[PDB]
Each structure stands twice: as structure tokens, then as C-alpha cells.
Amino acid sequence: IDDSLDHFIRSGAIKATEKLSLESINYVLYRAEQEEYDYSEGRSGAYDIPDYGKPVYCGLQGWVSILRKIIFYNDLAHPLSNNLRNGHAAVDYVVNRLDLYKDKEGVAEVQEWLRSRMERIKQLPSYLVPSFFALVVGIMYGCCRLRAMQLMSDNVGKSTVFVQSLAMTSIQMVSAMKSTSILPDQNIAAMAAGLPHFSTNYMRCWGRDVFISLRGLLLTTGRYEEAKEHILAFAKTLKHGLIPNLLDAGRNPRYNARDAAWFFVQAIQDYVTIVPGGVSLLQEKVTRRFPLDDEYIPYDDPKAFSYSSTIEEIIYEILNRHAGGIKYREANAGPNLDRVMKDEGFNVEVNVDWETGLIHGGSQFNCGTWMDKMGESEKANSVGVPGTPRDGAAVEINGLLKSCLRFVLQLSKDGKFKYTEVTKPDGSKISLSSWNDLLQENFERCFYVPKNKEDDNKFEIDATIINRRGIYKDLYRSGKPYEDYQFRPNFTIAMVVAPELFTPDYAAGAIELADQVLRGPVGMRTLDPSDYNYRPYYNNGEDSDDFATSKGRNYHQGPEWVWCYGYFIRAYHYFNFLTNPKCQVEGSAKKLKPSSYLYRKLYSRLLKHREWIENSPWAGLAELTNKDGEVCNDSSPTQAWSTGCLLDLFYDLWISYE
């Protein structure tokens, strides 16, 4: 110890983080042990602290999540404190693990600073190592966290801890790997669905999760060049006019996702709206590594890189082939894809009822929507029975379709979209504006459930199968018609993406019920608690005979999901600002801005989320919660859409009122 040691430990950390990137910061702060194994061939992983366990990340966050409470109470008796006195192994671990990432941008310089300081720490008496270890880790952590805020956009860089803690999940989820990627020919940055189990090999990338999260994690933060690459990487995998959910790095993906293609085109609109010059995305040319029809997996055939498709025609191809109709049994169908799905479930069909203009699809043997839990309990007799098949008109799918139509209409107006016709299965043509005004007229009719019995004669209502009035149906003419009239948070997605389809008073009053019924403390209840099928506890290990709960069929009927809370409160915001006058105030220059009464309401519904990300060993939000905030031991501890959809809300408020 000398008077210069003090200045040595607190200096040089900002210069070390200089050449870092929002990608490379992932390798310094996070990296789940499974993500670490991916780079270490299974050799390394997370440091096992004796009489304690391992930090949840191999990076500095793993240390910080433990050290914060230790520094606060001076817990010199903590197992980590003891271990840091008895040896220099945790001291060396911090430095050595970066050998795995020494080649990535700025890590070599960060590693040298850590190395230079750690070596000087080891030359101290054993009882002084813990404090200097925690001090050095804390300093480099902050500088990396600062670098993240500098690289991200203003709205993130000037915000509260809670907003920044949300934004750091974008770094948790976006990294390059060795076992998987988003492109087949390269290994590049690929957004995981969540940590730790949705991070490696085929389990990492999921098209539904990528694009639902793309706006929040990538656009709200400013990672545009990373949002583009994820969009283009799925553009290559378009087939059946649909986007796959199981992106196998663009190498034999699974196409049972009726949802992904419309969240995909939604993100494209979000990209174009937000990115300065984002219209440039439309003319971007992509190598279409599949055929224009829908043949079969030919990843090695020379027809892979055969032809090119611009995002312009890629958007149109989704719209056109959807109208013209799509018929196909999934390629390579059989057990080698789903060892529990029945033979008729691999047959997926989707078309448009042109008397309404909305989109129907699926069956009682399918899981085409985000609620895609397939049962498997042999003892409970549910092998092959989808827990929530959502066949027919799904609210979001059509709401997302209206958003797409509204997008391409105003787009062609500006000379950026050359398409106007659309071919029907017979041979008819319909303008996009005609299809648009079709949904505008028929949507709220087919989906609303009036509060007054008098109005049932106008909204195609079968009052025998109802539960609550003043609601938008979850589905339209499905398989089980009582599943049409279930209160589910899914309708909030359509309210967010295409609010033109909703009359303000109906949407306002409907979402006030979700506030009283479907809104948990952190999660959105996936099913009205008054329904008979309501089972809000999810055990993917239950062996018993219960037809509902065994092998986790409850996944989408009761359990409280967090990413739906994002789409909910975004609409809760929009329609409480349009409807209730107490939620409005004459903002500067008389433009309409929300009042403190509305802000106070939004604030009270995010406290339980701030509490969660604060007291979470993984510095993020769970993917799922059991009834009334109870921790679901099978829920992923950090998920992308869980945080990316709260960021969605903050960007709304920012991009509109600040």
C-alpha cells in the first residue's frame, strides 16, 4: 500500500472501455454459464463460490449482483469475502475468462486494465483483497454501464435507473455465439429469447420473440444496425408467405408460426418509422435461401442463394400469398420435428374470409399463435392436444394486418411501394385500400362484445356462450366457440398496432376491465380468472392425471406473462389519453399532453416491475409469473419481450411528449 496505489486503482478505466461496443459489453458484464460454455467448449463457466454457489453471469454483473448487498452491510464474513481472502482464484477468474472474448471489440483493452489492476491487488495482504476486488470490479462495471448509455440513444442515456436497467437487457440478449446465429453463412450478433435456457444452439433465436422485442430492445435503444440485420436474416427464411418461429440460424427453420410473419412486418414498419432514413430498408436486397414456392429443405442445393428478393417484394409476398391462399403440410413433417403433434396438425391452412377481410387459420391440432403450448402428458391423456389452439381469426394477427395495410397504403402514397393489386384464389384482384377498408368496417363488428344485450344483433353474438360484456373477443369463429369469448390480453396488441379499428369508448371501457381482471402485479393474466379453464400455476414437471395442468398445458390459461403487460399498458395509456378528460392537460403550445393524474396511474403500474428488476439476481424481468405475482420456478428469469415491451411504453411517451 502506497499513496499512489489509490490513484492507480481508480484511474484508466474509462480509457479501457473506449473501444467497446454494445455487442462486446455483453461479454464483459453478462454471459450465462451456458453462453460461456458455448465459447469454452465446456471447459470454463461461472466461478463456483464455496459455501455459496455461482454468480448467475460470468461477467461483472454476476459479481455486482452479489457484492452490492455485501458492500452495504460490510459483510466481511460472506462466503465470497472468505474466498477472496483464502486465494487469488476469483481475482484471476475475472481476468482469464476474457481470453474467450479477447478478440472482440474493446475487450482486450478492458481485459488489460482488469489484468493490470488485479495483479497489483494480489501483491497486498490477504485481508485487503476483498475490498479492492469489489472496488475494482465496481469501477469497471460502472464504466461499461456508462459506455452502454453513451452508445445508446438520448432517451435511454438521460433516464432513470429503471429505464436503464431495462435497456441493459438489450445487451444481455444480443451477442455472437459459436453454436448458433441468425445467418447461416456467418456467426454474428443474435438476439436470444431469454437467459439462460433460450441462449444456445437451436434454442436461442425465435422469430416471434425477436420482432416483438425488436422495437424495445433495438429501436428504443438505438441499435438500428442490429435491428436491420435481424430483419434481413429472417427475410431469407420466408416460405409459405410466413416467417418461421424456430429460426435454426436460417438452416432448416420450423414454419408453424402464423404469428411471426405479422410481428415481422410490424417491426419493419417500426424500423422504417423510427430509423432516420429507414425507408432505405425497403429496397435492401436479400439472398432468398429458399424457393419462391414452398418445396422442401435444400440447405445445400445450389438453389439456396438462387434468387434475390427486396424487402419491398418480401412485404408484398406476405400480403399477396395470404390472400391468394396458402396450403401445405409442413416440410419434413413427422416426429423428427414434433414428437407429440398429431398427423393432421402438420397440415396448416390459412385464408381470408373476404366478407370480412380478416385472416383465419389453424385447427384443434395446431399452435400457430404465441399461445403455443402442446400437451404431452401420457398419464393425463393429452398427447397431441394443444392447450390453447387459437384457430380462425386471431385479434392480433388481423390487427397486425391492418397496421401492415395502413403502412403500405401511406407508403405507396410516398412512392416507396409499387404494389396495389392482390390476387384472390379464384382470380380476382382487390386493391390494398379496399382490403384496408374491409377490415376497418368488419373488424370491430366481428370482435366486439357489447355491454348492452340490445346491440347483440349487430356484432355476430351468440349470447349462450359469454362471460363478460364490454370486451373484444380473443378469437372469431374458432374451434371451440366458447374460446372466442374469453377475456385474454391478446386484444391489446391490436389496440396498439391498429387503433383505427376501435371506437374510443369501447376500447377504453374494455381495457379498464383488463386493468381490473387481467392485470397482475408484473404479469398479464393469460385467462379471465372467472373462466372454468383458469389454472394460473405452471409446472412443466407435473405427472398427475389432470387434463389441464399435467406437463404444463396451463402455460397460456392463467399464468401471468410480462411481455403482454407491455402491450396492455401502452394501450391503457393511449385510450385513457383519448377518452378520460382528467388524463389530459394543455401541454406547452396547447398540444395535447397527458396530465399528472394519468402519469401517476402509469407510474403505479410499473412499481412492481422496478421492484422485480431491482431484486433479481439476473438484472432483468421474468418471462412468466404464477397467480398474483408468485414466482414461477419454471419461468425464465430474464426474457427479451418482457423488458422490450416496457421499453416500448417509455418510447411512446418520449417520442410523443418530449
Binding site: 432516420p276 432514413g277 432505405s280 429496397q283
Partner: protein, 266 residues
């Protein structure tokens, strides 16, 4: 708002110099337009001309300027507009000149001689600088950093050109100078232009292809583009030189060079 300047004139209609900055030009300040407003919405600047009371120019005095009197009216260098000079022996006259579009404007005075003839002062020019925005980020003319790049050394592809764009955008230039992008003549120099009316076919296909690349520079890298323009000559192998040899100096057009032709042919 207040976007007016005072251009005092002498008793002979010459502009008064307020400070000695050296030999210069009557340039108005480089300023962005007000909040969210277009060139049509308001006069860019207002030049208030001050005429001295009882000066010789006040006798039937008129101000003539090629400054269009409306935003709708286009600018013709040779079309001038009349403004009457309010004659007083005690009070000066002031004459606003509303300006709606950047460019070069000029003004002179006409008055009645001491022989009751019509006399005219010299033309006096003043300049309105353009308003350079990149993405609604105003760029003052004194903060421009321009990169000169020669296209025939930027590789053969548009994709091979955006590599140079990103390199200079990292060095934080905000404007790129483009050596002429048209089909070059025999000796392949960028300034000897084969055809001035379409671009280099080795890299470009249509006018839209270059306008989109230039716009791509504007939105992805916040960089503005400008090109060389050659007026003094064309390349010695223009396909239109055969259809139009009079655009140069011939034995027909410029006969004095006949004595000079037979000196090179000898």
C-alpha cells in the same frame, strides 16, 4: 420575428460601409429559418434601404431590383421591379426589400438629372446564403467539413463506394465533394466529359440510381453531397461533337483561328 437589416445608401445611391473588414461583399448572415417553417412561409430576410433626405436621387427617384416581389414569382436576372422613393427634405426614406429565396440579388436607382434627363446609378449586388440542413439539423456555412473523393478510384461498384462513405463519415465530415460522375472521354480524366447528360455507366444505370445514393448519404451518414461542374470544355470525343461542331471554335465560328489551324496542320 426580426430578420431585417439596414442598408444605408449614400447621396449617389452607393451603399454605406459601416466597418472596414476589407474588400468584400454584402452577404446576409447564415441563419436557419425559424421554427418548422418553409421558404414560402415568410421573407428570408428584409433589406431596409435608407435614402438620404433631399439627395440628388430623391428627384423622381425610383429603386429598381431584380428581387421578385412574391415567393410565387420566379427570379429573372433581367426583370427588375419599381419602388418609389418618398422625397422629403427633412426626413429620409426607407424602402423594405422582402426576400423569399436564397441567391444573388441586385438593385440600382433611377432619378431625374439636372438636365431633366433620366440617370442611373451602378448595379449593387447583395447575396443571400443558402440554408443547408442535413436531417433538419442546420449546418452553418462556417462549420462545413468537405471531403473530396475521385469516383474512378473508389472501386467499380456502388457497394464499393459506400465503403468510402462510411470511412469519411467516421472522420466526421458532413459534406462530400464528387469529381464529375459522368461518362469520361478518351483520356479518362474526370473533367474531360464524354456526355454531360448521363452518368458513368460502369457504376450507374439511371439518374435515380445516383439520386438515391446521394440521398442514402444524406440519411444514413448525415452527409451532404456536391459535385464538380465543368463549363469551359468537353472531352475531345463527345458523340454530340459530330452532330454539333459549332459549340466550339471553328474556322466558321471563330475565323481568326484559320491562321492558327494551318500552323498546327503544317
Amino acid at each position: 420575428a426580426h430578420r431585417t437589416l439596414l442598408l444605408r445608401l449614400s447621396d449617389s445611391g452607393e451603399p454605406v460601409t459601416s466597418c472596414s473588414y476589407g474588400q468584400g461583399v454584402l452577404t446576409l448572415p447564415s441563419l436557419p429559418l425559424p421554427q418548422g417553417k418553409k421558404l414560402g412561409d415568410m421573407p428570408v430576410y428584409t433589406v431596409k434601404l435608407a435614402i438620404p433626405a433631399g439627395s440628388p436621387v430623391t428627384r423622381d427617384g425610383l429603386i429598381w431590383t431584380n428581387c421578385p416581389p412574391d415567393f410565387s414569382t420566379q427570379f429573372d436576372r433581367e426583370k427588375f421591379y419599381k419602388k418609389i422613393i418618398k422625397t422629403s427634405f427633412h426626413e429620409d426614406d426607407h424602402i423594405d426589400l422582402d426576400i423569399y429565396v436564397p441567391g444573388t440579388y441586385c438593385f440600382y436607382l433611377s432619378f431625374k438629372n439636372d438636365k431633366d434627363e433620366l440617370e442611373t446609378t451602378r448595379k449593387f449586388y447583395f447575396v443571400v446564403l443558402p440554408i443547408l440542413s442535413v436531417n433538419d439539423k442546420f449546418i452553418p456555412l462556417n462549420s462545413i467539413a468537405m471531403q473530396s473523393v475521385v469516383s474512378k478510384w473508389m472501386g467499380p461498384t456502388i457497394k464499393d463506394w459506400e465503403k468510402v462513405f462510411a470511412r469519411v463519415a467516421s472522420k466526421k465530415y458532413n459534406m462530400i465533394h464528387f469529381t464529375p460522375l459522368q461518362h469520361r472521354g478518351e483520356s479518362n480524366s474526370p473533367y474531360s466529359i464524354y456526355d454531360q447528360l448521363e452518368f458513368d455507366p460502369t457504376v450507374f444505370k439511371s439518374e435515380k440510381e445516383v439520386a438515391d445514393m446521394v440521398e442514402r448519404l444524406r440519411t444514413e451518414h448525415n452527409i451532404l453531397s456536391l459535385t464538380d461542374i465543368v463549363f469551359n470544355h468537353t472531352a475531345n470525343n463527345s458523340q454530340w461533337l459530330l452532330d454539333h461542331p459549332e459549340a466550339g471554335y471553328n474556322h466558321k465560328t471563330s475565323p481568326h483561328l484559320i491562321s492558327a489551324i494551318e500552323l498546327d496542320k503544317k
